[PDB]
Amino acid sequence: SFVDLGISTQRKIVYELYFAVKYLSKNKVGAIITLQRNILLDSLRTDGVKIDSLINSSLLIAIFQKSSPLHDGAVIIVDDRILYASTYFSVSESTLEDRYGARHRAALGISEVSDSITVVVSEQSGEVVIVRDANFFKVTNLETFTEVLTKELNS
Amino acid sequence: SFVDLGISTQRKIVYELYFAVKYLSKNKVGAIITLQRNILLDSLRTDGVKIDSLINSSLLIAIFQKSSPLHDGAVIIVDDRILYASTYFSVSESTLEDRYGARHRAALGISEVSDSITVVVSEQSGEVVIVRDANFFKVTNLETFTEVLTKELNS
């Protein structure tokens, strides 16, 4: 998991996610990006496309554009690799405030059955939340994104 | 290179290329897809992103679509992986007809200094050409694309 990775790989992962999330939030492009940790997600997802790409912000941006056939569903990141795109989780049965949608219910569902950390970008507002252990954490100042994500990945 | 892979892996790669090229030609989305063979291209390309991903038609479509930061430049396929995206070649200084733009002169350029096989989709017309040894093969009927590309890849 993340804590096992070398520091340069740790920093690369958060940096590429930051630059992708910055673009997606700014342009109000919806996204679900799940980082696997100790619980293997392979048996907790359905459908999707195996990509097995090195993590890169440009590719993550491309994946979630509306003209991309991969923009629906979730990206799964394992270590420094974008392993899957367009994969689907069992959504949470919990009810959320009206401002949240299916991306958040999906992120909540996978966080309920795993120790994964999920980043959601809202298509409506560009709002960015980090989802872990059935909890939301709003990231209103994206200049703190790198700090907050790293802390969550080390919990 | 391609001929060293098993025939099943070869067939899978060509199908993913065919499905991507069908879509890109139909939708008149420009693209350059270079398949490396015996001559290594790593010092013949500039910039781009090393994504080292699996070969998948949905991923290729996302790479070349309108709002992808990776749609400018070429994809390089090495064995069964997309090694680089959005990478630039030295263009051929040979003069082409008006129907051919920068994508074609770039494909011509890489085919003049290597044994690679390059598929080009024109953004203007959706026309498909296969570029090898400084020559163009028009593929006017995409139902022949799988036959033509496989034959070029093997001789």
Ligand SMILES: Nc1ncnc2c1ncn2[C@@H]1O[C@H](COP(=O)(O)OP(=O)(O)OP(=O)(O)O)[C@@H](O)[C@H]1O
């Ligand atoms: N040296 C190169 N290597 C790889 N791909 C290239 C190269 N030069 C151009 N291309 C590709 O050719 C595409 C089409 O070029 P087009 O003729 O539409 O514009 P251009 O003349 O290259 O310049 P611009 O669009 O910036 O005015 C570019 O978007 C790029 O993807």
Ligand SMILES: Nc1ncnc2c1ncn2[C@@H]1O[C@H](COP(=O)(O)OP(=O)(O)O)[C@@H](O)[C@H]1O
């Ligand atoms: N179970 C799920 N797992 C992963 N992604 C999902 C899931 N359900 C919905 N999504 C994604 O959420 C996005 C929008 O969901 P949608 O069904 O349009 O409702 P909403 O707009 O209210 O979120 C789509 O891109 C879809 O792929």
